[PDB]
Design a protein around this ligand. Sequence first.
Ligand SMILES: CNC(=O)[C@H](CC[S@@](C)=O)NC(C)=O
Ligand SMILES: [Zn+2]
Length: 153
Amino acid sequence: SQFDLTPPSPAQRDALIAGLSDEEQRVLLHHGTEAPFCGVFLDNKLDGVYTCRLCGLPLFRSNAKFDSGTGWPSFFAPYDPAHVREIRDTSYGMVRTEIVCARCDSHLGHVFPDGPPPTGERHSLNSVSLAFTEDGQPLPNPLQRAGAETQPA
Ligand SMILES: CNC(=O)[C@H](CC[S@@](C)=O)NC(C)=O
Ligand SMILES: [Zn+2]
């Protein structure tokens, strides 16, 4: 990865958390799920990068976005394999794989093996877990880190 994946320290973490909605906290920090069909990014024409709403880490490119019919924004591949981490989720007596932001450990959604080609993979996202940066615009980079994060998306 061209990005510094070092977790923010408790101070940087709380600084960013403080800027977060009630609802954003519910999803990102407490494993919550958006009401399906309601998220701002469910339909989004634009070319660019979907970043972690907490720490700004690029998570998904628009060129990997597709319509799954589930009511959540969906991607067949992450920005970079190392940017999205998989965690076992046994909640609701189901067996699922939660996806978290590899840097800040925030909740994003789940990944499923029922996606389309090329990958056969479906990353199912909460729109509220994401911020969007259009192609060529500067990334939010709230942790002010070097490398690709100072570059336009
Ligand atoms: C089987 N599908 C599920 O569990 C989906 C995955 C959505 S992502 C945004 O967490 N969620 C439900 C049923 O709440
Ligand atoms: Zn993050």
